[PDB]
Amino acid sequence: SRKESYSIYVYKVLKQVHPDTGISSKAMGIMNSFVNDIFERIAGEASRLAHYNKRSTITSREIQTAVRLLLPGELAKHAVSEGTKAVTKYTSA
C-alpha cells in the first residue's frame, strides 16, 4: 500500500546535523514514532487550549503556548524561538 513516513525529512535533518553519521532502520522507525507522539501531544494541548478558551481555530499562539507548557524551560524557550522564527520568515516570504 501507500504508506507515509518522515524518513526523508529526518534524513535531511541528519545530513545538516552530521554529514558522516548514518542511522539504522530500527532507529528511524523509533524516530518516526517519536515524531508522531510529539505531534499528537502538542496538537492535543493546542486543541485543549482552543476548546477551553472558546476558539474553533488553531493558530501559532496556541502551538507556542502548548510548546511552552510541554517542553522544559530551556527547551521550551528554544523551540518557541525556532517556531516564531519559522513563522516570521514564512509570513515574510
Binding site: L49, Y52, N53, R61, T65, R68, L69
Partner: protein
C-alpha cells in the same frame, strides 16, 4: 514569607498522614517539596491564564493544571 508553613503545621499534616514521630530535619525538606510542587502547579496555571490574555487566575485554570499533573480535583468546575 516562606516561614508560614510552620513546625506545628507540618506536624499536624504528618499526624494526619499516619506518621508517629518526626525528626527535626523533615521540615526543611517538606518545605522544599511544597515549594517545587507549588511552582509546577502555579506555573501551569499562570501559563493557562496568560494564553487567554487575562490577569486574574481562576480556580478553573488551577483544576486544569492539576489535570495536566494527573491529580485532578473535583468540586471546582471540573
Amino acid at each position: 514569607n516562606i516561614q508560614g508553613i510552620t513546625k506545628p503545621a507540618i506536624r499536624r499534616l504528618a499526624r494526619r498522614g499516619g506518621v508517629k514521630r518526626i525528626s527535626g530535619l523533615i521540615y526543611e525538606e517538606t518545605r522544599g517539596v511544597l515549594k517545587v510542587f507549588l511552582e509546577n502547579v502555579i506555573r501551569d496555571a499562570v501559563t493557562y491564564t496568560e494564553h487567554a490574555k487575562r490577569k486574574t487566575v481562576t480556580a478553573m485554570d488551577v483544576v486544569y493544571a492539576l489535570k495536566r499533573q494527573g491529580r485532578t480535583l473535583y468540586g471546582f468546575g471540573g
